[PDB]
Every structure is written in structure tokens, then in C-alpha cells.
Amino acid sequence: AKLETVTLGNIGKDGKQTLVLNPRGVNPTNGVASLSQAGAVPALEKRVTVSVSQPSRNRKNYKVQVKIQNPTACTANGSCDPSVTRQAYADVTFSFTQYSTDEERAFVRTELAALLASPLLIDAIDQLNPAY
Amino acid sequence: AKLETVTLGNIGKDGKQTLVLNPRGVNPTNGVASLSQAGAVPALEKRVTVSVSQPSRNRKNYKVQVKIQNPTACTANGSCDPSVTRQAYADVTFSFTQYSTDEERAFVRTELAALLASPLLIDAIDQLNPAY
Amino acid sequence: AKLETVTLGNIGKDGKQTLVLNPRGVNPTNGVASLSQAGAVPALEKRVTVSVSQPSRNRKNYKVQVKIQNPTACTANGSCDPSVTRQAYADVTFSFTQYSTDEERAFVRTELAALLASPLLIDAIDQLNPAY
Amino acid sequence: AKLETVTLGNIGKDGKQTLVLNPRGVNPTNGVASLSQAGAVPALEKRVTVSVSQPSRNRKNYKVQVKIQNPTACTANGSCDPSVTRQAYADVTFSFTQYSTDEERAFVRTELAALLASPLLIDAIDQLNPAY
Amino acid sequence: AKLETVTLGNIGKDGKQTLVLNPRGVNPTNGVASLSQAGAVPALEKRVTVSVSQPSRNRKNYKVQVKIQNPTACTANGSCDPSVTRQAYADVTFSFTQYSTDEERAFVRTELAALLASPLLIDAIDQLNPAY
Amino acid sequence: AKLETVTLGNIGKDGKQTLVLNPRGVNPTNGVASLSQAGAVPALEKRVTVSVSQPSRNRKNYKVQVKIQNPTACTANGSCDPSVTRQAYADVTFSFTQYSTDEERAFVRTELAALLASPLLIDAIDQLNPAY
Numbered sequence: 001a002k003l004e005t006v007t008l009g010n011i012g013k014d015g016k017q018t019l020v021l022n023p024r025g026v027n028p029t030n031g032v033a034s035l036s037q038a039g040a041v042p043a044l045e046k047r048v049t050v051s052v053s054q055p056s057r058n059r060k061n062y063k064v065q066v067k068i069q070n071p072t073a074c075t076a077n078g079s080c081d082p083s084v085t086r087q088a089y090a091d092v093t094f095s096f097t098q099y100s101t102d103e104e105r106a107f108v109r110t111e112l113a114a115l116l117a118s119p120l121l122i123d124a125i126d127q128l129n130p131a132y
Numbered sequence: 133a134k135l136e137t138v139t140l141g142n143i144g145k146d147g148k149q150t151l152v153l154n155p156r157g158v159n160p161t162n163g164v165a166s167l168s169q170a171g172a173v174p175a176l177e178k179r180v181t182v183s184v185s186q187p188s189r190n191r192k193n194y195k196v197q198v199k200i201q202n203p204t205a206c207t208a209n210g211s212c213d214p215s216v217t218r219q220a221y222a223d224v225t226f227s228f229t230q231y232s233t234d235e236e237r238a239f240v241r242t243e244l245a246a247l248l249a250s251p252l253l254i255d256a257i258d259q260l261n262p263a264y
Numbered sequence: 265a266k267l268e269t270v271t272l273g274n275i276g277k278d279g280k281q282t283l284v285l286n287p288r289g290v291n292p293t294n295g296v297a298s299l300s301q302a303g304a305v306p307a308l309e310k311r312v313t314v315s316v317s318q319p320s321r322n323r324k325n326y327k328v329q330v331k332i333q334n335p336t337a338c339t340a341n342g343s344c345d346p347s348v349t350r351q352a353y354a355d356v357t358f359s360f361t362q363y364s365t366d367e368e369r370a371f372v373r374t375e376l377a378a379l380l381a382s383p384l385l386i387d388a389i390d391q392l393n394p395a396y
Numbered sequence: 397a398k399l400e401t402v403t404l405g406n407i408g409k410d411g412k413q414t415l416v417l418n419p420r421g422v423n424p425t426n427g428v429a430s431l432s433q434a435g436a437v438p439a440l441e442k443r444v445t446v447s448v449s450q451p452s453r454n455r456k457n458y459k460v461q462v463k464i465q466n467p468t469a470c471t472a473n474g475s476c477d478p479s480v481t482r483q484a485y486a487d488v489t490f491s492f493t494q495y496s497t498d499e500e501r502a503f504v505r506t507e508l509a510a511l512l513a514s515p516l517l518i519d520a521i522d523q524l525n526p527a528y
Numbered sequence: 529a530k531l532e533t534v535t536l537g538n539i540g541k542d543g544k545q546t547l548v549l550n551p552r553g554v555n556p557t558n559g560v561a562s563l564s565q566a567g568a569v570p571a572l573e574k575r576v577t578v579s580v581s582q583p584s585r586n587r588k589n590y591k592v593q594v595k596i597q598n599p600t601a602c603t604a605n606g607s608c609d610p611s612v613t614r615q616a617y618a619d620v621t622f623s624f625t626q627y628s629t630d631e632e633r634a635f636v637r638t639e640l641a642a643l644l645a646s647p648l649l650i651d652a653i654d655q656l657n658p659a660y
Numbered sequence: 661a662k663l664e665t666v667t668l669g670n671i672g673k674d675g676k677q678t679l680v681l682n683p684r685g686v687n688p689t690n691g692v693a694s695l696s697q698a699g700a701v702p703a704l705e706k707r708v709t710v711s712v713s714q715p716s717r718n719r720k721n722y723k724v725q726v727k728i729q730n731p732t733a734c735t736a737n738g739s740c741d742p743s744v745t746r747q748a749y750a751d752v753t754f755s756f757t758q759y760s761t762d763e764e765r766a767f768v769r770t771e772l773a774a775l776l777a778s779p780l781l782i783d784a785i786d787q788l789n790p791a792y
Contacts, residue, residue, distance in 0.1 A: 001255035114140035123133030265519035297527035378404035387397035529783035651661035
């Protein structure tokens with residue numbers, strides 16, 4: 001699409017947070033758009049990436065994949081600038097036949113958005129206990 | 133969580149559709165919960181799967197992964213029972229340090245759900261045109 | 265150029281048809297812009313692609329190449345969504361020395377456009393009989 | 397068709413030039429028609445060539461291809477007769493199924509002629525800047 | 529940034545010249561933006577290029593590099609269109625840790641700009657004699 | 661030139677800082693002049709270096725290159741003297757034919773200084789986002 005500044009609301013465990021992702025570049029040799037929460041230092045800011053890839057005689061399917069990467073920082077022992085002490089990642093990969101309709105594709109996008117909101121996925125992701 | 137019958141609403145290109153996923157089994161040797169829209173014949177019904185997996189000395193990270201799979205069917209040439217004529221898949225994989233807080237995990241989950249609703253991701257998925 | 269939505273008229277055997285090509289992305293790893301007649305399903309829509317490529321120590325010449333690809337579809341045997349039952353392609357490849365003037369290049373472009381309108385090229389492409 | 401003398405008008409950067417291509421032969425071992433602006437010396441005259449080639453069990457497709465070759469000359473250093481000091485080439489290759497209709501072929505030819513007049517294709521060829 | 533038309537003033541040995549660099553394209557397979565003083569023939573025009581490159585598990589540092597390339601042309605012996613008879617190149621490469629602040633980067637940028645105005649660098653570049 | 665103490669003003673993100681570089685030596689086996697902001701401890705001070713190199717039957721071109729190296733120090737972990745916890749480097753490399761005029765070289769030098777002040781390069785170096 002148009003590589004706007006995308007800004008998500010009603011985010012978080014709260015239900016009441018927000019994230020502004022400014023469009024920190026497009027192509028990096030490898031056809032991947034890129035966004036990131038304007039932060040103190042490059043190493044420290046949340047990120048997202050989106051890429052679509054037309055089918056090449058090799059893999060015959062359209063393939064969209066999104067990636068989230070949130071670093072967390074600690075002003076580690078008595079030092080100065082903070083250190084990244086772990087990262088939480090997420091990435092989806094959609095796969096669609098050349099012959100799929102946009103109604104089909106849109107259903108999959110929205111089905112996953114609804115599924116992430118479900119009580120089952122909340123205990124799978126928030127609480128990390130499995131499903132019995 | 134508890135392996136309920138999950139029912140997603142406000143789904144679809146419309147914004148006004150709904151999906152009931154009935155809990156068609158749990159463990160299949162490989163720790164994967166499993167649901168499916170009760171449909172005419174096995175081969176023909178929407179699916180989802182959920183798995184979280186504790187870190188084992190090998191991979192040190194908790195890893196949650198969801199998978200969507202929607203067959204689309206055609207009452208193919210002058211025959212009887214319909215055939216699957218293509219499938220649209222999606223799958224996410226969350227990755228969290230052993231040392232991450234649920235606020236972090238829940239934030240990643242909700243950011244992805246909000247991002248799937250954003251205008252940028254809609255053109256990537258529904259319309260498959262990339263980001264410029 | 266600016267990746268506008270290009271809209272060609274007075275097209276066709278008629279001389280009286282029109283084609284709107286909406287700019288379905290730019291870079292796909294391999295510097296190829298891309299347009300497409302917004303159509304029912306990905307596999308089914310007309311396309312064009314444009315690429316220029318500066319000379320790199322290897323090939324000393326600027327090289328422009330455009331590509332046309334029109335699928336033609338049949339609601340084949342008593343099924344549903346139609347199948348692509350053939351494609352007609354065309355592609356030009358312009359080659360210009362680093363030392364060429366734009367008048368030189370523009371002449372070649374317009375000569376080829378004029379040549380495609382000529383009686384000789386019409387029997388070569390439309391009617392497929394050669395030239396005697 | 398008939399290997400007439402073809403004469404292209406409204407050519408050039410101007411829009412107001414013309415090219416007379418006189419039919420300097422047909423077959424040269426390899427079924428290639430051939431034209432040339434009657435010029436001072438063989439090496440110095442603009443050319444075009446046309447070939448169609450019936451499908452042979454090898455390649456199952458009819459294949460038409462046209463080739464432009466315009467040499468540019470300089471009465472280089474205080475000498476006599478001019479030299480070719482570069483060439484600008486263009487060539488198309490059409491590819492059509494045995495099962496294609498002339499309407500299909502004609503649409504491709506006219507689409508390509510229309511496309512060479514478009515503003516986007518002008519910056520790729522005349523100004524050589526790519527598409528963003 | 530936005531790939532504007534950059535126009536540098538107070539340039540040159542004089543201190544009193546100006547250079548218009550028009551944005552002749554962006555990506556050419558390898559993520560390199562590109563500008564050039566619109567000149568007679570491609571081979572003959574001044575150029576500049578800019579690239580940033582996110583660190584990839586390989587090289588852990590952000591790396592920005594700018595490149596200048598000015599051909600000089602001679603209406604070479606008794607000919608026509610001139611030939612390029614030498615080029616003067618310059619290229620910078622900035623290298624920054626992921627954990628650097630923009631104040632740090634801005635300091636290096638402005639330090640290098642001030643340093644090119646200094647009396648010492650002028651005898652190194654303009655006059656090519658070393659430092660004693 | 662004469663290896664003066666160079667002192668750059670109007671430096672920095674501010675535009676309103678200054679840097680004194682005192683001439684801490686010349687030759688170190690490999691013909692490299694050398695300067696540095698007098699700082700607490702060797703490991704901790706800003707640097708610059710300049711070299712010209714006459715062309716030797718090998719590389720036929722004069723080649724001037726400047727290098728910036730700014731360490732950043734943190735009175736890290738409840739210790740004493742600080743440690744260098746990252747460095748920001750920059751280096752240019754000018755390359756001139758034996759047959760270049762100093763006006764050409766001076767133009768490249770001043771062209772690169774103006775270019776570091778331009779709005780485009782500022783977003784490349786300070787903000788690290790590329791050009792679109």
C-alpha cells in the first residue's frame with residue numbers, strides 16, 4: 001500500500017495503549033518494508049516488517065509475511081545507555097493460490113485477528129500454558 | 133487454556149460474518165490442539181491449530197505457533213460430492229525468552245491483531261500489492 | 265517515472281477499447297516495476313512490467329525491457345472459478361550506449377510504436393503469416 | 397503480408413518526423429525479412445527485421461519477433477567517410493499459443509504500441525530513469 | 529528522506545558555483561538511491577549515490593555510504609559528441625553501532641563537513657601535497 | 661600542508677559546538693598524518709587522519725583519504741576510569757587521475773561538504789532512514 005505511518009490503538013494487556021510505527025525505509029536489497037517505534041536508539045525500538053512476493057517458477061504461490069520484533073532494555077548495572085536483555089518476536093506467513101479471491105484472503109487475515117483476541121490464544125500466548 | 137468451542141465474529145471482508153470452530157481433538161502425537169468448522173466432509177472444513185512448547189535443552193525459547201487452513205471447494209465437473217480446488221493457509225510463530233513477562237507476550241499478541249486490521253496490512257493481504 | 269495508474273485507449277483489434285493498469289507494486293528483489301488490469305483473481309489479470317538497468321562492469325550498456333502478459337480464461341468443465349487456458353506474451357528489450365542522446369532513444373521507441381501500427385507488422389502478429 | 401516499403405510517420409522526439417524503410421531483401425538463410433532506410437553506405441543505414449516462425453515439435457508456440465537497429469555516425473577525426481560510433485537496438489518477441497485468436501494477438505500488439513506512447517514508458521526509454 | 533531534487537550552492541574552488549542534482553531513480557537491485565546533474569548524454573553527467581543498510585547477522589553495524597563521481601569530457605580530437613577522458617571519484621562510508629545516538633552520528637557528519645573546509649584538508653585534496 | 665592544530669566550529673547536531681584537534685604525530689610506518697582531541701586517556705579521544713599517496717606503477721591514480729573515529733565512553737559498572745563502549749567511524753576516499761585539474765578536485769571536495777549539509781544526507785546519517 002502507501003507506506004504511511006501506521007498507528008495502532010487499543011493495544012496491550014491493558015486494552016488501552018497505542019503504538020506509532022514510523023516508516024523507517026522500504027527496500028533493503030530484500031523487498032521488505034520496515035516500520036519502527038521512534039526510540040532512544042536504533043538497537044532499542046520495536047519493529048515490524050511486511051513483504052509480499054509474487055510467485056516465481058520455483059514456488060507457485062503468493063506469500064505474504066509479517067514480522068514483529070520488540071526489544072526490551074535494562075539500564076544494566078551502574079552503566080549508562082541501556083542494554084537489550086531480550087527480544088520478543090512474532091511472525092506470520094500467509095500463503096495463497098494464484099486462484100484465490102480477495103474475499104478468501106481477507107477472511108484469513110480477519111480470522112487470525114479474531115483468533116488472537118480469543119480466550120484460547122490468550123492463555124496460549126499471555127500465560128503460555130497449552131490447550132487441554 | 134480450556135479447549136472450548138471458539139467462535140469468531142465480525143470476521144470477513146464484510147466485517148459482518150462469523151465462524152464456529154468445534155474442538156475436533158487435542159494431542160495427535162505432536163502436542164497440537166485442533167479445531168474445525170463442522171462441515172460436510174473432513175477434507176472440506178476450515179481448521180486451526182494451537183501449540184505452545186516449553187524450551188528443551190536444544191532451543192532455549194518458549195515458542196507458540198498458530199496455523200489457519202481453509203479449503204475452498206467446487207462441485208467439480210458434473211460429479212457428486214465436491215472437491216477441494218485450493219487452500220489458503222496462515223501461520224504465526226511467537227518466540228519469547230524464558231525471562232519475558234506476560235505483559236510483553238500480551239503486547240506482542242495484541243499488536244499483531246491490531247496490525248492485521250491496519251490499512252497497510254490489508255493491501256498486503258487482501259489485494260496483494262506490496263508496500264511503497 | 266512516477267508509478268501512476270497508466271490507462272491505454274484506442275487499443276484492440278477494434279481500435280476502440282481501453283485498459284487500466286493499476287500499479288500493483290514496484291521492486292520484487294529484481295528491480296521490476298509492475299502493473300495489472302484489476303481482475304477477478306490474481307492468476308487471471310493482464311499485466312505489464314518495466315525495468316531499466318544501469319550498466320554494471322559486465323555489460324556496458326543501459327538496457328530497458330518491457331513485458332506484456334495477457335492470460336485468457338475459460339469457465340472450463342462445469343466447475344467454478346475459471347482456469348487459465350493460455351497466455352499471450354510480448355517483450356521488448358531496448359539497448360542504448362552510455363553515449364546516446366535522448367533524441368536517439370526516443371526515436372527508437374516511437375519507431376517501434378509506429379512499426380507496430382504498420383500493415384506489415386499487423387499481418388505478422390494478427391494473422392501470423394510471414395512477409396513476402 | 398506483402399513486403400512493401402513501409403513508411404513510419406509522426407515519429408521522433410518531435411512527434412513530427414518520418415522514416416522510409418526500403419525492403420532490402422527477404423530470406424537470409426534464416427527466414428528473416430529485412431528493411432533499411434536507403435543510406436550512404438551499408439554500415440550506416442537504419443534497419444528493421446521481421447520474422448514469424450511456426451511451432452516446431454521443440455517449441456510448441458508461434459513466435460513473432462521484430463528487431464530495430466539504428467547506427468549513429470560521426471565524420472570522426474579529420475578523415476573521410478563516417479564511422480559507426482555506437483548503435484541503439486530494440487527488439488520485441490511475441491509468443492502466442494497455437495490456440496490463440498487473432499483478437500488476442502491484435503490486443504497484444506496494440507497494447508504494446510499504446511504502452512510505448514505512455515508517460516511511464518517515456519521516462520524509461522527517453523530519460524532512462526526507472527519506475528518509483 | 530524524501531528523494532527531492534538536491535541543489536548545492538557556494539560549491540567549487542570559487543566558493544561561488546551551484547549544482548542541481550535531479551533524482552534519477554532509486555533502487556537498482558542493490559538498495560542505492562541515485563542523483564545526477566542533468567547533462568548532455570548519460571555517460572557525461574555528474575552523479576551522487578546514497579545508501580543506508582540495516583545490520584544483518586553478518587555485519588552488526590549500520591553503515592551509510594555516499595559516493596560522488598564526476599566525469600570530465602573532451603570534444604576529443606576532430607570528432608563530434610565528446611568522450612569522457614577521466615573521472616574524479618569520492619566516497620565516504622559511515623559506520624555506527626546499533627546503540628549509537630543521532631547526536632553521535634550528527635557530530636560525525638558535521639565534523640566531516642567542517643573538516644573538508646579546513647585549511648589542512650584543502651592542501652590534501654586540492655593541491656595533493658601531504659601533511660608535514 | 662603544515663600540520664597545524666585544526667579547530668572546527670559550528671559543528672554538531674546543534675550547529676553550535678567546537679572541536680580542537682591537536683597534531684598528535686605524523687608518520688607511523690605508513691605515511692599517515694594524525695590528529696586527536698586531547699582527551700583523558702589515549703583510548704578515549706576523538707581522532708582524524710589524512711593521507712595522500714602518489715600513484716605507483718600498480719594503481720595509476722592519486723588517492724586521498726580521511727578518517728574520523730570517535731569513541732564513546734561510559735563510566736561503566738561502578739569502576740573507575742571509563743571504558744570505550746562503542747565507536748562511530750567515517751572515512752572518505754578521494755581518487756583523482758594524474759591528469760586532473762585542482763579545480764576538479766576542489767569541486768569534489770566542496771561538493772561533498774555541501775552534500776553533508778543537504779537535507780537528504782541528514783536523514784541518511786543522523787536518522788538512518790534511507791531515501792524514497
